[PDB]
Ligand binder design. Sequence first.
Ligand SMILES: CC1=C(CCOP(=O)(O)OP(=O)(O)O)SCN1Cc1cnc(C)nc1N
Ligand SMILES: CC1=C(CCOP(=O)(O)OP(=O)(O)O)SCN1Cc1cnc(C)nc1N
Ligand SMILES: [Ca+2]
Ligand SMILES: [Ca+2]
Lengths: 675, 675
Amino acid sequence: SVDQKAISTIRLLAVDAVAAANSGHPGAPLGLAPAAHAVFKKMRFNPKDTKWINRDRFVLSNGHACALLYSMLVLYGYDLTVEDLKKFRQLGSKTPGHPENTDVPGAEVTTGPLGQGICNGVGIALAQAQFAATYNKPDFPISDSYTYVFLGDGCLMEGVSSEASSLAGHLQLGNLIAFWDDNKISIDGSTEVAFTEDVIARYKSYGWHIVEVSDADTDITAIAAAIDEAKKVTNKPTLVRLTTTIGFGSLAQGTHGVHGAPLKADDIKQLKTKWGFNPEESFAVPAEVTASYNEHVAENQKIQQQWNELFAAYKQKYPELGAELQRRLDGKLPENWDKALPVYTPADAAVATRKLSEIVLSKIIPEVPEIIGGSADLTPSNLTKAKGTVDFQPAATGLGDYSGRYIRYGVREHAMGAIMNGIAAFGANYKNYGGTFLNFVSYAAGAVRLSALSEFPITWVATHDSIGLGEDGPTHQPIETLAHFRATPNISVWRPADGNETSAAYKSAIESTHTPHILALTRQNLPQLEGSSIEKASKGGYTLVQQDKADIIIVATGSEVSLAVDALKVLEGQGIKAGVVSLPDQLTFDKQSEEYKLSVLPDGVPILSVEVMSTFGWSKYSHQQFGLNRFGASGKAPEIFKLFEFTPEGVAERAAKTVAFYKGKDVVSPLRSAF
Amino acid sequence: SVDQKAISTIRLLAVDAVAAANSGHPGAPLGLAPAAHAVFKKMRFNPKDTKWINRDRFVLSNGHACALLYSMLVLYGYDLTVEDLKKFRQLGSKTPGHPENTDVPGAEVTTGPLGQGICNGVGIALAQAQFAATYNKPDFPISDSYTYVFLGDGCLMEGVSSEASSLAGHLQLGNLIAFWDDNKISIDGSTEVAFTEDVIARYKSYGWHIVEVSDADTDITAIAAAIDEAKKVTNKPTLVRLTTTIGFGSLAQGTHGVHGAPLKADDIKQLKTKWGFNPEESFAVPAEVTASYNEHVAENQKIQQQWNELFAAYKQKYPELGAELQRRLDGKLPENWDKALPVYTPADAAVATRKLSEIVLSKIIPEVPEIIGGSADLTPSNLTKAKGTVDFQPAATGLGDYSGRYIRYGVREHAMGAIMNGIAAFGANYKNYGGTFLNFVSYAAGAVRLSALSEFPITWVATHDSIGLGEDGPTHQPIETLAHFRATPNISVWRPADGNETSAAYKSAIESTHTPHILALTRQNLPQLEGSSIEKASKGGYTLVQQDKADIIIVATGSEVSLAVDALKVLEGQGIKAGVVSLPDQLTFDKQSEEYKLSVLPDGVPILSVEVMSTFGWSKYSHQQFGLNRFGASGKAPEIFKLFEFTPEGVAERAAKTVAFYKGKDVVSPLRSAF
Ligand SMILES: CC1=C(CCOP(=O)(O)OP(=O)(O)O)SCN1Cc1cnc(C)nc1N
Ligand SMILES: CC1=C(CCOP(=O)(O)OP(=O)(O)O)SCN1Cc1cnc(C)nc1N
Ligand SMILES: [Ca+2]
Ligand SMILES: [Ca+2]
């Protein structure tokens, strides 16, 4: 039949792509082609408009199987061709070895690191529910789309997927439909060696609905029926168990050897002949398959055409909501939204930057509807909920509503990170955030790195940033954390010193379209600085205290800027004139012009950095570094700072030693380099 | 009764400790005191010999509840006193705000980061099973101890605990007994807001046995009976559901407010009076409680005395095994074990360092019985299993035996990391390792940092270290990873360049007693270097190519050392004389004498670093840095190196620019500093 021919075409495109690269993963594509065919036939999408906001979304969580995804996208006429498939896994191609949303049209998210995609799917579904609750009206189903996720055994073993699946069940996300490739094989062989749990019983315990498809190698009727069944269960996410043979059709089907290496040439020949293809031909696309797939595309395009008319009618009936929705789909924030950002003067009281963050959120959440966010069980510590907002919960619980704006993630940092990526991936200008203690952002490193690679404007509200947290001690006190994330490409790591800098950090985080943000915030109170402003802090680094005859410049961040200012006073009593630079975000600073950067970190003067964390990275900006390269301590915070000599006198001593060390030496800016 | 008085004493010590610090967590200690009393009465331990190898182990996974643990240790006469409790959470005390195994006698592991302790308990239990299978004989139950773990809702939400619990169920670890503090409260309030899964059904799906104690606020008879029941189930780990009231007895019991802040003074008074204590007194220890606890200690000490006689008789009957066991309990490796390390010459073939690692393991596993390890579903890629070894599995599966040495962790990096910490914590000189791709060590950052803080000699076999892996692309290619772990205190991060350096890295990793190791290993082949040896590489950094008239020194690691040597040849054609330094472990190098380090990185010569990852950290050792500070690419590895100019010519160009940049400048070693 044409459906059978389509499945064979998908299988053989994937195998031929792996063969041409002599690299990649044929097994799961062979096993999942029937399901992919069935799911894409149920999905609404436009290959010519990948951003249609009411499309169904597909996520390949088992991203190594991407030859399957690329084959689907090619067959459906996305901006990806057979010539691109021939360049699978080749430098510079549109068909990289794992899917990248920045590079591959129709890849919603970046997968490959196992467990992430299913969590991203939870976030897409969460966003869809919130979006629909915000905009839909009687006779106006602006948003009614589904989220389809493929995942394998590896994703089910990764703890991040358990976190997200527990939360998705709690949140009753009935438009999420996930499909487990139950093939009983991973890299180490049979799942009997390491993965013998009753997966189905576990998913029932989370509150998911289950459909089992015992013969998913062939039974596309049952796969389609499973989707129909899942759509009837509106208050539970559904897991469809697809019992498949890895590498179905290969001589090596059902073995670990078919997971991750190209098939033998003779194996590919026998696949082709028994499915009615020419064993001498590669990359075959039967025109009847193209015709069948084009019929579905044409129907989907008529659905989108009707949606556009629905949206036009919505703007007539609901002019305010319609204009808001249009602005969001255009990727634009509200005009002058940033006038809501709080501004401080040096006469204002000292405030912890976690509390300054609460105040910012309180002012901007009512002004910017596309802001939603939550905390990983640290709401009263991170200060991430604006008073007067409701939680995102299914109304059936009585605890919130899907129109709510505040997410109770529970103690689930990694899934929070990956869910945030999915919310961003949904689109509609969502600017979403997640709170935890800075030291436990590290639990979510897998997802954070993907925020950076995927270019998603997510925000971590990362409080309790240092030894300044005090008594909880070294298991809670960051040392390496900022260095880790600053060393990752494309992460803005803001460590604001005061009220104006905290507003600048949020301005950056909310305006972002391609760069994730981490806001490192204090437990403890900090003074409002003389010389700070949103304008200057928006440059990422700026001269706080200018000293034209400086013997030294002290560059600092966060809580250490006030320390530097106090050290300047001690140094004056010692006959040493210092300037102070505040460097609230190294990435933003780096992106400024060379002339601007040199105005902050000039030639001809020694520069000392001060930050109560690792010294890694700081030589970009300084000649000498005063940091903390050992673990912390459990005690009252001021006593810890004294122990480690992060005091005005301790900074002054090191500044005086720095001046002495460069006496008689020629000093050029740390910004200079040989290449 | 005396038991009731003991429970009250525990509760009030914990509350008084929090009160004195005006900081910490009274709620879970109040709720868990009955269970703690009951469990410690069942446990075999010697407060005067915390390292008795056949002790039962206790782990407080909900480490914020540590005032409870400290109270137990004080009451039982560990090397921790009431005067230490009065210094809870104070700088320098033996009672830090979360338990630290390095500082607290009777703390087996370091907890506080949620989810870790239960996984550590899985590792202690895994080690006990392996140890017993190795040494026990008829009439000689050398090892028969249990592992008791307390955990809360937060631990159950963290994905790492799901990973470890799935694996523990698979491994049929019947000597593991965990207790869930089912109090329905976390920081954000009721668990109804975020954690509504059926925990018990989930644990049944993993293959755990369940006992439910409905009234764990009072029913110590039922808690004791639950332990007895768990001990009868020898082929399943057991979860005991302790239904408790958080803060039991407080005016604020059953609320989130009692989780994490000191009680009000009037609340403490009413607690005391209704439990028969003096409300004017703090830190009371009724002598009848001390007497009762001392009786149990005395009985346990007689059990250990008998165990010592059993061990003496074992050495008579099984002289070889007995001597091996004695050596392990003394903390000593086999005499001359390192003679098994492979040695290479420059005439030997090129080999990938992952394959060199396989060869090392093949030689040393038969020589050092305390080496065990595994991989997170990457055994045929990491090359972590020695041929001829058997997997650690319950014999009932037919897939291995508890005497086995190779662990199939599944796709569970984070739990693997925390399980490794538990295996190390068991003691008996275990030197254990875990394989994954370097980029996915980051999934386990929570546990890795705790390896460093806990001073455990665990080893990550972290292959596929760079863009050298090729086609899998940027989701798999480390950039920030080495900088992250090098910036963490107390992590040795070895990146060996060749066969001799790989043997040095293993010598360090296996000899370690207080420092975790990460071995960053290649997919791709590397040549054997002229000038390498185990002896020189053991210094962490060494001069590979000495050039007395050097215009520049190139410092490199791993795959980039051979690149530097090839660049030296290009530079000679340009009239530039270079030396080469290999820096296989920065931490080991840093620990060498100042004179040794200056002999490697002298004054008076520009130094360029080359490593195909982040430049962070490298200014410790170099004036200029050639690294990769952007994400990678999917393609054949040699083409990626060419794209980024990590070629002999590209390195030479940057070296020549470095020489030019320092013309007419005075250059001192990067090792010099002002303070
Ligand atoms: C183990 C591993 C794989 C097996 C999956 O096993 P599976 O899901 O059951 O896939 P399959 O049925 O065999 O096609 S892929 C890649 N990899 C390394 C890998 C490890 N860890 C992380 C976080 N991401 C990865 N990418
Ligand atoms: C959320 C959080 C806590 C609530 C636990 O909730 P729980 O386990 O149910 O504890 P409880 O019954 O209330 O005493 S403690 C500390 N903390 C921050 C915290 C967050 N993430 C990690 C990895 N470790 C932590 N330490
Ligand atoms: Ca599988
Ligand atoms: Ca709880």
